[PDB]
Amino acid sequence: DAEKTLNHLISGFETFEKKINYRFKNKAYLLQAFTHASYHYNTITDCYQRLEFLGDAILDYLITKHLYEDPRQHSPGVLTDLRSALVNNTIFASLAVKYDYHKYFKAVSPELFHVIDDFVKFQLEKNEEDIEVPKAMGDIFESLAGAIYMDSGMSLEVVWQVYYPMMQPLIEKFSANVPRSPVRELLEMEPETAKFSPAERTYDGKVRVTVEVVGKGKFKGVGRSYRIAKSAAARRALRSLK
Amino acid sequence: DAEKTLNHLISGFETFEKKINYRFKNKAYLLQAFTHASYHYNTITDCYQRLEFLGDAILDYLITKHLYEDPRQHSPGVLTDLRSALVNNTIFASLAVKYDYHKYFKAVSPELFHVIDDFVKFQLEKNEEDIEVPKAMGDIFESLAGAIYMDSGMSLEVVWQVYYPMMQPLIEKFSANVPRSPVRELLEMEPETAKFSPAERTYDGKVRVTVEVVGKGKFKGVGRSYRIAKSAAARRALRSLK
């Protein structure tokens, strides 16, 4: 008999919905999100794997919409590093356990749990390297996103309401700690008080540019593109004025 | 002088906006989307690279929302193949030229254009293998998506209004031509007239399942997960009834 097999299965999820602050209308989405493959007891939904897939795309689109909107207005080279370091099944996974995803994880695997656990313990100790990683726990951070979306009528903002909070901090500590895109570093630096020459091309076919400043004189950049010539000019500048 | 440098730069884009059926309020988004790095003439926007990045995520989220909603309700193994074959900078690129993206591409590179061209010609001939690929032309199929979105106040549906049309056909020809997920192959096949045993586990620890049918008798599947045991049961079934 179904309708009750289920309550059986979601007993406890009460806290989890509390912890993450969201409340599932179809609880079956919750459960599935969390049903691994080895959990041969659940016969009423698919494992979460199909919601893992979906969820990726979402977190992607999102962490990306994010990084790209950052007023730090990153260079595109650092954007793909940042994208790459932030979407990352190992990060996803370290969030899940920061968030207890592993307390409601449904599977059959002692094997897997000593892992999952040796893994959980590492994370927290660290929090006042060589430690292997429970793939699945990035995998469910994904799935849930899928789950929640599918719950809210496919709402991106909703999923974001929930998940921002969780990465917001990580995302932020990554970015402060990068290459200050040097034009922006210093359009910011000296606002309307630094000026950029038209672009002018060169004998070995590169673009060159030149920056003047407030009685701090003028610096001269070169590179194979404008964007680059520009920052190279900025970079030599940025240097002086320290 | 700026305001006119620009009209200079977008002369022609009239057709392109026509061809794809969309009309840019800020034309500068259009232009940028299309400004390569080697195009040292444009000094009023960034090259499109930052909009390439953004655009990826979008097409991703989208082609994905797509594949996952497909009533064929694919297995998750085929979903990542399909995702992988459809998002693919080489496909993106073959759409761009199917769509003339290359007529409005701004760059400096004869070098690149013999490529771009030897490339364009190949595609069309084919249309009533060893041919190398202009990365940039997937790259701008992406960017535009970025562009358009950024134009429409960040509207996903809008970008989709435009881009669906372009992949809709490709997407569709890929899917018809895959592994028919065998449960679905035949919940479809024989609707309410095929039944699935509870799951029952085994001596070497796998899940097993059994399917009965309309006086077409009963077939028996095994695999390390339920989902799998199921289709394996389905598969042996599917076989008989041909």
From Swiss-Prot, chains A, B:
Annotated binding of Mg(2+) 2, by residue: 52, 139, 142
Domain DRBM span(s) in chain numbering: 178-242
Site residues (Important for activity), renumbered to this chain: 135
Domain RNase III: 13-153
Free-text tissue specificity from the UniProt record: Isoform 1 is expressed in a wide variety of tissues. Isoform 2 is specifically expressed in oocytes during their growth (at protein level).
Effect of residue 135 to A/R/S/T: Loss of activity
Sequence positions bearing Phosphoserine: 197
The protein's assembly and partners: Component of the RISC loading complex (RLC), or micro-RNA (miRNA) loading complex (miRLC), which is composed of DICER1, AGO2 and TARBP2; DICER1 and TARBP2 are required to process precursor miRNAs (pre-miRNAs) to mature miRNAs and then load them onto AGO2. Note that the trimeric RLC/miRLC is also referred to as RISC. Interacts with DHX9, AGO1, PIWIL1 and PRKRA. Interacts with AGO2, TARBP2, EIF6, MOV10 and RPL7A (60S ribosome subunit); they form a large RNA-induced silencing complex (RISC). Interacts with BCDIN3D.
Function: Double-stranded RNA (dsRNA) endoribonuclease playing a central role in short dsRNA-mediated post-transcriptional gene silencing. Cleaves naturally occurring long dsRNAs and short hairpin pre-microRNAs (miRNA) into fragments of twenty-one to twenty-three nucleotides with 3' overhang of two nucleotides, producing respectively short interfering RNAs (siRNA) and mature microRNAs. SiRNAs and miRNAs serve as guide to direct the RNA-induced silencing complex (RISC) to complementary RNAs to degrade them or prevent their translation.
Stated name of the protein: Endoribonuclease Dicer
Organism this protein belongs to: Mus musculus
